[PDB]
């Protein structure tokens, strides 16, 4: 991929006590035109791991196709083994690194959240094969905008409950609505626990415009 | 070039202009921009002319061979899946604006969108082409859930006529098609 | 294009061809490439047609005013220097000019070389043009300071003939001037096809 | 840049080259040889790029020797020259073209002496004299002046000395020494080396 | 251009029962000549020649590949080749190098092997054949050769006036060109014999 | 972006006679692959003994013609006489060189009578170098006309042909025949042929049609 | 280069011109631009002259191979499908602009083919450099289901509009009339441009050219 | 950026979004895109920010000085003439999308358009900006001759809201202004 | 002018017996967007001459301003002299040629029609200062499209009456509507006579689409 | 390309240049002079572009002579050197820059001998020896090897001959002749010309 046609935008993610919560919006902008304003950008992998992505969307449907097959292919064995969320983060790294070495990359930036064996997991994957783990992640402009709000709380308080974490994302999703030209006031929140993967519906934000009456 | 697709309760309604241009000269004054694939599935094409003619003949070859094996009428989602495979694989080589619509026995009317990237999505209504940006704010202020067939023929006719009036690459004559369980009603309109 | 000039005991010899091309197309065969500045100065045309034609005519406009004011002809080193300063103001703007200045002086014979780059140099023998390097071989093998008058006529006429043979951009006739103490004199003008029968035997 | 010369006689071929192997300012080697004995009556002179001269001309060198050992007799200088032209033209429209300039000197028992000319675009020519390099410009009009088809081998060495002294006079490169061969009905004979006391 | 790297000029002209062909003699790199005996006209059987002009590499290369295909043709068939058959043969050889093309433009002239009928044609550098009835030209100095042949050509000419017409056409057009000259050779062939003459030209 | 030049075609011919001069040109004005008009002669009567032709970029041909006609009047009120043929050729070289670094894209040929009553032809270049010749052909079809006039007028490459000077009537049919052969092979040539004849009795004009394709 | 076609009430009339140029110099005064395909199908060529010649002979070879194996008359849609699928594979490197016409069992059919592989079925088309001038005559003076001489008059008028525009021809307007049973092919249908006569004496002498070396070789 | 101007019987109605962006980042969340010049003449500006601020201050200086000499209220056509002189002269240097509207005693309501070229034309209604292409076919199917003031405030509010929903460089908050013989009614709206 | 922003299109013109008729459409296209679909592109100069233009429209309003002043400045003298249509064609040529020599041209192409002293006049002016006279003119694509229809009639018949000429333009304006991507079905016709300059209103064409029912 | 050399002594300055005025292959003039007597104790050596050498150095030549006639006494070699540097640096940021390379040789009655170095970017340096051109690379390490600050003028000519013969050996250009000056308490004295019998 040399020219991303239909792109998404920033994706957030943060650990908490016993799970990982991830949010992203529902917009398929084409340049500046917000052409596809009802799409899903979060894929529920089997029961513990969970994927959201940014960048080109046609490339995202390709990885949605390939990862969908690999999960089915292990469940048909029935040997009691599944892919850990760290294993998906390992496989996806080698897929991206091999793809840029042919100089024909996949224009994406992906966030992998997972909860297995009582342990949360939150991983980053770049287009160029740069991958790491962190207690809080943000892609796009959210690495410039929402990322300082995430780190200030986690340094002042290292662990978070579920209601604290979910409330904190809605604040950061509000701020991205004010100052990102590719944002949209309709997003969805996905959350892994030990109970499984759950995806909330098309939520919305609440804006303030009292400074408009000022000069 | 402006193409149009609206589903309703019975089936779908398609529509397009003609005016195949080359630079600032109209090469073809009247053009079938919409193309049959199977008896119930059409597509309307945009982008490069020689590319989209070559893709639509390959999908008709594959889907037409595929239904004779199953001895079943094909799914509309199956036809939209085949355009996605050729466009995503041969991206950086093609400029295709395919919209697939048609009636299905399992699912009724459906409308799918395959833009130049290679993605696929189902929509209630879909437009495309060069002159699609002009009627683009008219269409969602005028659209209303739960139309009849005759309203959708009136809806797309007024929708295409605004871009055909305005966009220089668009215009000519309006070609419409209504696909339902009964048959295919094609007509040529001016107004 | 091929010109040459050399000085010896009895003055200065000037000779040149007459072919002017335009790309691969021959414009003419009768181009006078030796510009008669004065009854006592001669200049050549080597590189650029209107550039060598204009600035030497402007030099001839200048030396006449010098003669009227000072009641004396200009020296050869002076006329070479005035042409060098006029061209140097347009350095880099794309002039083509590679001429030579010939003439008798109070110091004797005079031979200077002038570029469009500003290479004002004196010397004894010069050869400028596209087929210039074909002339340096045959001239320097036959050159002497103590040549005769009729011998020096045969040397320069041979040297242009060998240049027009190998080079493609040189042909036409072969002009020949002789600079004497009183003034220049035209010697002859021979076609190459006539010289081909003479030299082959 | 470097120099070759090709004086052809009635029953002999006089060739000479220079002995310089410079590297961009300095002159690394002053006794370099550019002469390749293809056979007992055929020489080869090669001027070109830094690597393409040794790689190509040795490929022709060992391939003509294969013809001698396998058939028992020697190639003619005409066929040996016309085999080399086939090898550049085939290897021209490729990712690896050779950029060399050649001239061939041979003696035949049936056809007498022969001289051939070769461009880096692989064009053949049958010439009574030839030269390569930048010194080819200054010198071949001298050689065009005093050439006679019925010339003796003593005049040809003298005409070669006239041809080289003007390259000592008005040529910017140094070029002090010049190796000389001669080919006749007997074989390749080496004449004495030509050097120059300048001043 | 690459066609202007060595120069050249080939002209053919149709007569009454005969046909003539001519070319120059100069070989040289862009401005420096090398020799004056470069062959550009090659015999392909009896009463049928071919002329080549352009890049001197492809002049010698195509003339050897075409001779390779001709001798294999004239052994699988006892007959000689017809002039139309050679034109279709050359156009096949040029079009195979469609994207790596040889830089030459051939000219074919000859009589019929059975009857007396003359034939002239010329091709492009990728093999578009073109038969005429009066003359064909090729080379760098093309426009000079059109100006002479449009004025001097007559329909039905004996081998005497055919020789004088193509001589005056080649001498006046090439002397106006810079990179062509140094002698002109003329082949005039007919049913009974083949005459080759060389003309007295300007050697400058 | 904006480019200040375009090519318009045209062909100019001049022949210096013994006591006459003939200047001829076609009347086709073209651009690219189009025909603007079929009636646009390139001849211009400057004086009663001087006709100029102008080819090349047509916008400079209209400008340069009007500059020359102004300076003819400036000569005459300052010197009480008309310019000669050779004086105009000397003046034009200074005008063309005056825009050396933004040149006129015009080929010029001046034909006319001298002070002795003989023909005189001065050819030019776009920068302003000139010489006196006996015949020149300028324009697009210039390469198709020079080799033929060397044969007929100059008698080059001919053996045992005497040199009779060109009469007026013989020179007319030479001009009419070279443009018929030029209109067959050149695309920028046709639709008419305007011929001007300068003698000691005035300037005659004559128009001969050509092929219209 | 100007080619055009039309569909009248019974068949198809094709038209072309007779000039091939190189640069801005007329190379050929008479070039055949209407090519044979089958005894019912013909094709007009525009663009690169050698690319149209080699393409129109390959498809004419395969349809002769196809119809002789089948045993019946070819179809125009078969020739359309071969051409548009060949040219798409070369990505428009082969510069060929074609007008395809013929009469099948189904009737007359006229196509226009672009060098990238896009085809159009139309009642009348123009291609080439002078196509804009010829489309003026069609769009002004076309009416459906014309007669025989009404159609031949229209195409000969439309080609002549391009000839008196630039890059026309040394005009020999060609016509190919294809009907259900009769096939016509007319090379000198109209000659409007005549070269004027030569009015000069060009006396050549047997011996006015110097010869250095003569050579005689007899034959049999 | 999307700007809007509709005249009616009494006067004119203006409207714009805010969202001054820079690349893909919003620099200013709320922005007065419409600017007073005289007491009855506004302009709404588009294109480069630093260019159109510099032009509008110069025209206010010239027109404000010009009316004190005449001791008369200025004409709207006089104000639109001054923008044309600066934009046509300093073209190839500016990117200005000025629309001038306002009430005049001699002529009532007027709307003028000065696009990036430098031409000037009077229109019944005029739009402009980057997101103007999207509502561009909505506006002429919805426009109707002979509206009241309250219809035009309803007309431009629905017109701007479609581009603000859609275009990424547009949105924010709607600023409206009604200019008549009585006064200037400015209001800030969201909906 | 280096980049024409708002452009027009082709302008026709043809002489007849005792007058000149000129037509052009009413469209102000911006690239491909037909942005200004009601503008006038024909200027009535004083009583005999008359101007239409193509190319950039903002440059056309400049020449509309300057020529408007020069005509007023001669009428205030009242000496019984006016500008002939050939004089306007001379002045406009020098204005365009001087403007390109500064390498800052006026992006237009202008047609001047005039009738004075019983003589019709029809002149062309290019952007580069190329000017000539002709019995029929066409700019834009009309030089490729409508120009062969004009020349075929004038060669078959050199003179035309007024009803023949006005009918012939409406045919050529119809053909430009079919095959020009910048055309518009609303044009106006201006005509000079000895009675003065008269400009007809926004006329329209009549199209045929019977070939659309064919395959 | 061409060559300069600057051996400085205890009470003398030894300078030498070459005599070549070549044109792109040929060598037009073999007795060219590159030495400019600014005053009675100051020389000037100039190497650069084709026109900028004569135009600039004569501007300095006639301007120092104006100081002598107007004040009655002569410039010091320090101030004369430091006036030239002011003229390049002012004329550097302009549409007409001069591209020459200089070195200055002077003798003072109060300060003894002096040598200065000049780049085309107008940088001054006070050096015990200097050189310019491509031959400056091969030769100045020889001159760095055998230099002694207390050296005699007879050794300096001998050290100059060592410095030039290796440029005769491993340098691609021809350079046959070399003119030599010397400056002492008396004035500019011309030593004999240095030429080379090569082989």
């Amino acid at each position: 991929t040399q020219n991303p046609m239909v792109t998404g935008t920033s994706v957030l993610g943060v650990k908490f006590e016993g799970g990982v919560v991830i949010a992203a919006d529902m917009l398929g902008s084409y340049g500046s035109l917000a052409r596809f304003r009802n799409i899903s950008r979060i894929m529920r992998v089997n029961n513990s791991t969970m994927l959201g992505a940014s960048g080109d969307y046609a490339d995202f449907q390709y990885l949605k196709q390939v990862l969908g097959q690999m999960v089915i292919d292990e469940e048909l064995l029935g040997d009691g083994h599944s892919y850990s969320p760290r294993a998906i983060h390992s496989w996806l790294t080698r897929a991206m690194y091999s793809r840029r070495s042919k100089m024909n990359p996949l224009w994406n930036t992906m966030v992998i959240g997972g909860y297995a064996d009582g342990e949360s997991f939150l991983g980053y994957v770049d287009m160029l094969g740069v991958a790491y783990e962190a207690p809080s992640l943000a892609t796009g402009y959210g690495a410039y905008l929402a990322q300082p709000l995430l780190r200030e709380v986690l340094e002042k308080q290292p662990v978070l409950s579920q209601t604290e974490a979910r409330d904190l994302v809605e604040r950061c999703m509000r701020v991205l609505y004010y100052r990102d030209a590719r944002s949209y006031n309709r997003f969805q929140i996905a959350t892994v626990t030990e109970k499984g993967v759950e995806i909330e519906g098309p939520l919305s934000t609440e804006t303030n415009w009292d400074i408009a009456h000022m000069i | 070039t402006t193409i149009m697709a609206v589903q309703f309760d019975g089936g779908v309604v398609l529509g397009a202009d003609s005016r195949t241009t080359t630079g600032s000269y109209i090469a073809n004054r009247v053009t079938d921009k919409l193309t049959p694939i199977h008896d119930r599935i059409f597509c309307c094409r945009s982008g490069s002319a020689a590319d989209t003619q070559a893709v639509a003949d390959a999908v008709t070859y594959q889907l037409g061979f595929h239904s004779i094996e199953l001895n079943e009428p094909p799914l509309v989602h199956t036809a939209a899946s085949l355009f996605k495979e050729m466009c995503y694989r041969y991206r950086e080589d093609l400029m295709a604006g395919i919209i697939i619509a048609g009636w299905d026995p399992q699912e009724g009317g459906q409308v799918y969108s395959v833009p130049m990237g290679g993605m696929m999505v189902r929509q209630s209504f879909a437009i495309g082409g060069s002159g699609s940006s002009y009627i683009y704010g008219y269409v969602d202020a005028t659209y209303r859930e739960g139309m009849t067939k005759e309203e959708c023929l009136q809806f797309t006719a007024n929708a295409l006529a605004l871009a055909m009036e305005r966009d220089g690459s668009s215009g000519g004559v309006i070609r419409l098609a209504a696909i339902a369980e009964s048959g295919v009603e094609r007509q040529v309109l001016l107004g | 294009t091929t010109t040459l000039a050399f000085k010896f005991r009895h003055g200065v010899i000037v000779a040149a061809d007459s072919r002017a091309t335009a790309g691969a197309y021959i414009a003419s065969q009768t181009v006078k490439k030796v510009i008669e500045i004065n009854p006592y100065l001669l200049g050549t045309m080597a590189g650029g047609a209107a550039d060598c034609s204009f600035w030497e005519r402007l030099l001839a406009r200048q030396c006449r005013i010098y003669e009227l004011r000072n009641k004396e002809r200009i020296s050869v080193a002076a006329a070479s220097k005035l042409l060098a300063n006029m061209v140097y103001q347009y350095k880099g703007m794309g002039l083509s000019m590679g001429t030579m200045i010939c003439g008798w002086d109070k110091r004797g014979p005079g031979l200077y070389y002038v570029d469009s780059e500003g290479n004002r140099i004196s010397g004894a023998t010069f050869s400028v043009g596209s087929g210039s390097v074909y002339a340096y071989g045959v001239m320097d093998r036959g050159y002497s300071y103590d040549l005769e008058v009729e011998q020096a006529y045969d040397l320069a006429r041979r040297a242009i003939y060998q240049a027009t043979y190998r080079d493609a951009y040189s042909g036409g006739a072969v002009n020949l001037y002789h600079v004497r103490e009183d003034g220049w004199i035209r010697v002859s003008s021979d076609n190459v096809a006539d010289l081909h029968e003479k030299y082959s035997g | 840049m470097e120099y070759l010369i090709g004086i052809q006689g009635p029953d002999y071929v006089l060739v000479a080259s220079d002995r310089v192997a410079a590297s961009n300012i300095v002159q690394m080697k002053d006794d370099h040889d550019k002469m390749f004995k293809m056979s007992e009556k055929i020489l080869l002179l090669c001027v070109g790029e830094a690597g393409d001269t040794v790689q190509f001309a040795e490929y022709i060198q060992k391939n003509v020797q294969l013809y001698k050992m396998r058939n028992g007799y020697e190639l003619s200088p005409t066929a040996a020259a016309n085999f080399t032209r086939r090898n550049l033209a085939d290897c021209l429209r490729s990712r690896t073209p050779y950029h060399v300039n050649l001239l061939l000197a041979g003696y035949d028992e049936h056809e007498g002496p022969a001289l051939y000319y070769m461009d880096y675009l692989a064009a053949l020519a049958k010439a009574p004299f030839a030269a390569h390099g930048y010194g080819a410009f200054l010198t071949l009009s001298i050689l065009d002046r005093y050439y006679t088809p019925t010339i003796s081998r003593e005049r040809a060495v003298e005409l070669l000395r006239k041809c080289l002294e003007e390259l000592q006079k008005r040529f910017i490169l140094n070029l002090p020494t010049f190796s000389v061969r001669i080919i006749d009905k007997n074989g390749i004979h080496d004449l004495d080396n030509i050097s120059f006391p300048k001043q | 251009s690459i066609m202007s790297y060595n120069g050249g000029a080939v002209m053919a002209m149709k007569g009454k029962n005969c046909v003539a062909i001519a070319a120059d003699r100069r070989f040289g790199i862009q401005a420096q000549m090398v020799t004056t005996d470069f062959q550009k006209i090659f015999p392909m059987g009896d009463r049928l020649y071919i002329g080549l002009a352009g890049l001197a590499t492809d002049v010698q290369t195509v003339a050897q590949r075409l001779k390779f295909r001709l001798n294999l043709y004239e052994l699988k068939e006892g007959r000689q080749i017809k002039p139309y058959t050679l034109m279709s043969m050359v156009a096949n050889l040029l079009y195979e190098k469609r994207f790596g093309p040889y830089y030459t433009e051939p000219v074919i002239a000859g009589l019929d092997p059975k009857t007396f009928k003359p034939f002239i044609c010329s091709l492009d550098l990728i093999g578009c054949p073109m038969v005429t009835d009066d003359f064909v030209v090729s080379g760098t100095c093309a426009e000079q050769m059109y100006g002479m042949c449009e004025s001097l050509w007559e329909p039905n000419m004996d081998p005497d006036h055919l020789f004088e017409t193509i001589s005056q056409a080649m001498l006046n057009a090439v002397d106006r060109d810079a990179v062509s000259g140094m002698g002109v050779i003329v082949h005039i062939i007919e049913k009974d014999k083949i005459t080759t003459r060389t003309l007295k030209a300007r050697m400058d | 972006r904006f480019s200040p030049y375009v090519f318009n075609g045209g062909t100019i011919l001049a022949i210096a006679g013994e006591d006459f001069a003939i200047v001829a040109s076609d009347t086709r004005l073209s651009e690219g692959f189009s025909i603007h008009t079929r009636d646009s002669p390139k001849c211009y009567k400057l004086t009663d003994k001087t006709v100029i032709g102008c080819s090349g970029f047509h916008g400079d041909c209209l400008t340069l013609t009007k500059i020359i006609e102004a300076r003819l009047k400036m000569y005459k009120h300052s010197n009480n006489k008309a310019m000669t043929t050779g004086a105009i050729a000397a003046m034009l070289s200074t005008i063309l060189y005056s825009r050396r670094f933004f040149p006129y894209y015009v080929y010029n040929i001046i034909g006319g009578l001298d002070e002795e009553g003989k023909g005189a032809v001065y050819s030019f270049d776009p920068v302003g170098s000139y010489q006196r010749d006996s015949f020149k052909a300028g324009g697009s079809a210039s390469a198709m006309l020079q080799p033929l006039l060397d044969n007929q007028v100059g008698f080059k490459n001919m053996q045992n042909v005497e040199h009779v000077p060109l009469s007026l009537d013989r020179a007319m049919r030479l001009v009419k025949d070279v443009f018929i052969s030029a209109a067959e092979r050149d695309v920028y040539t046709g639709d008419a042929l305007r011929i001007c004849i300068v003698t000691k009795e005035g300037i005659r004009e004559e128009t001969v049609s050509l092929r219209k394709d | 280069t100007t080619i055009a076609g039309v569909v009248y009430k019974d068949g198809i009339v094709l038209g072309a011109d007779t000039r091939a140029t190189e640069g801005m110099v007329v190379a050929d005064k008479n070039c055949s631009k209407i090519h044979f395909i089958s005894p019912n199908i013909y094709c007009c060529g525009a663009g690169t002259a050698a690319d149209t010649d080699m393409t129109t002979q390959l498809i004419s070879s395969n349809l002769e191979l196809h119809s002789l194996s089948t045993g019946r008359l070819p179809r125009v849609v078969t020739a359309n499908r071969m051409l548009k699928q060949m040219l798409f594979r070369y990505q428009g490197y082969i510069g060929a602009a074609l007008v395809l016409g013929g009469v099948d069992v189904t009737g007359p059919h006229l196509y226009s083919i672009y060098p990238h592989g896009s085809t159009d079925k139309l009642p009348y088309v123009t291609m080439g450099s002078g196509s804009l001038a010829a489309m003026a005559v069609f769009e002004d003076k076309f009416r459906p289901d014309m007669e025989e001489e009404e159609a031949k008059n229209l195409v000969s008028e439309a080609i002549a509009a391009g000839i008196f525009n630039d890059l026309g021809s040394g005009s020999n307007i060609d016509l190919c009339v294809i009907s259900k049973n009769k096939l016509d092919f007319l090379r000198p249908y109209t000659v409007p441009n005549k070269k004027g006569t030569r009015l000069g004496r060009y006396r050549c002498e047997k011996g006015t050219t110097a010869v250095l070396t003569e050579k005689i070789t007899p034959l049999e």
Side-chain angles (χ1 to χ4, degrees), chain D residues 85-86 93 120-121 124 137, chain E residues 32 57 61 64-65 100-101:
Chain D
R85 187 260 173 191
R86 183 71 268 168
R93 304 290 182 89
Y120 68 98
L121 293 175
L124 279 172
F137 293 101
Chain E
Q32 179 183 3
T57 189
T61 302
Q64 292 171 355
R65 297 290 179 88

Side-chain angles (χ1 to χ4, degrees), chain C residues 5-105 107-149 151-184 186-198:
Chain C
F6 63 96
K7 63 183 181 180
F8 69 107
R9 183 178 298 277
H10 303 284
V12 183
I13 299 296
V14 178
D17 57 349
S18 66
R19 177 176 288 172
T21 64
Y25 177 72
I26 295 171
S28 176
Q29 292 289 106
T30 58
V31 175
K32 292 173 70 175
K33 290 181 181 178
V34 181
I35 294 171
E36 298 176 354
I37 294 170
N38 288 320
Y40 59 93
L41 289 174
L42 295 176
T44 60
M45 184 188 294
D51 291 333
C52 294
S53 299
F54 186 81
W55 294 98
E56 291 188 355
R57 183 176 173 86
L58 190 63
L59 182 62
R61 184 258 187 188
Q62 188 64 41
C63 295
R64 179 62 180 169
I65 300 169
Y66 185 84
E67 185 179 2
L68 291 175
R69 290 178 180 175
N70 294 317
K71 295 175 71 67
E72 187 177 2
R73 288 181 178 176
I74 195 167
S75 69
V76 179
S80 66
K81 183 66 178 176
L82 293 178
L83 184 59
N85 294 119
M86 294 186 287
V87 176
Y88 183 75
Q89 297 177 358
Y90 296 97
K91 184 177 175 67
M93 294 179 184
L95 289 177
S96 177
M97 191 173 180
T99 186
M100 294 177 285
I101 305 300
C102 300
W104 189 268
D105 200 1
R107 293 181 179 90
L111 176 60
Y112 290 90
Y113 172 69
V114 173
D115 274 325
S116 67
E117 295 293 326
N119 287 316
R120 179 177 180 269
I121 55 170
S122 177
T125 59
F126 292 108
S127 176
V128 190
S130 67
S132 66
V133 300
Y134 296 149
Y136 281 106
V138 61
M139 181 178 70
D140 290 329
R141 178 57 59 193
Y143 178 71
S144 176
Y145 182 74
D146 293 330
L147 291 174
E148 294 176 352
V149 178
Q151 292 177 356
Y153 289 165
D154 294 331
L155 179 62
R157 190 179 295 113
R158 170 73 71 182
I160 296 297
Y161 178 73
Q162 297 301 112
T164 59
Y165 186 78
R166 304 296 303 167
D167 194 5
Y169 294 101
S170 297
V174 180
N175 292 318
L176 184 64
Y177 289 167
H178 177 75
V179 176
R180 200 176 295 113
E181 177 176 1
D182 51 355
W184 58 267
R186 178 178 296 111
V187 179
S188 67
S189 178
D190 294 333
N191 194 1
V192 172
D194 294 331
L195 294 175
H196 182 75
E197 296 179 354
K198 182 179 180 180

